[PDB]
């Protein structure tokens with residue numbers, strides 16, 4: 454009876470195994486755009502993905518992860534609210550059964566169809582497993598997806614999904630350039646928070662871009678053909694793998710713009 458997204462094991466259940474679910478800096482949150490304050494001390498984000506080395510794509514039974522070589526400083530995030538250098542380790546998405554839901558963060562209560570998370574770890578901590586134990590261990594770049602025009606840079610991901618339909622399947626996924634998933638503007642909101650799945654560790658600096666990317670209806674429909682189950686088990690479509698907004702508590706969301 455492990456955690457997941459269903460009625461019986463979904464977000465409202467997680468606190469029983471992971472009491473940090475009711476903690477002081479949980480994610481995601483609603484971003485109230487009128488309360489978020491512009492912070493002129495924030496810096497432009499530096500997203501340096503030119504040397505990114507993708508390796509593999511894995512259906513882990515919750516989402517799919519596109520994994521990178523993080524054994525040297527290749528693809529890094531710095532600047533913005535961050536001190537120091539964070540190395541890209543993986544990205545993944547959260548999405549809905551319908552276009553009107555699927556994002557984890559919300560903007561003035563608006564849900565997007567999906568949300569991309571590029572996960573990076575603080576190189577001061579030496580590895581990804583040590584970084585998750587630290588209050589400033591991770592930096593996650595969050596990008597909303599809306600349904601409209603296709604995102605050409607997403608198509609290589611969509612096209613491999615049929616090879617990793619079920620939990621525990623993986624496929625080689627080299628030479629994928631994550632710069633093709635970025636919007637035009639790097640304006641962002643930032644706040645301190647957590648992983649959005651168990652173990653729900655409070656180790657994340659969240660950086661959520663204001664400008665969504667557009668993906669096509671066909672692209673997101675392909676995400677919704679994946680399965681949470683393993684091969685040879687009853688089919689459970691991988692949809693609605695998002696945690697709802699959590700209490701902001703004693704936190705301020707800062708804006709890099711306006």
Ligand SMILES: NS(=O)(=O)c1c(F)c(F)c(SCCO)c(F)c1NC1CCCCCCC1
Nearest residue numbers: 513515516545570572647648649650651652
């Ligand atoms: N939003 S997120 O970054 O918290 C996240 C998901 F929501 C996911 F659904 C997943 S799928 C694997 C769950 O074990 C994920 F890897 C991450 N990223 C992981 C990075 C930390 C190291 C592994 C522990 C799980 C979170």
Ligand code: NA
Nearest residue numbers: 522523524525
């Ligand atoms: Na290496």
Ligand SMILES: [Zn+2]
Nearest residue numbers: 545547570649
């Ligand atoms: Zn995520």
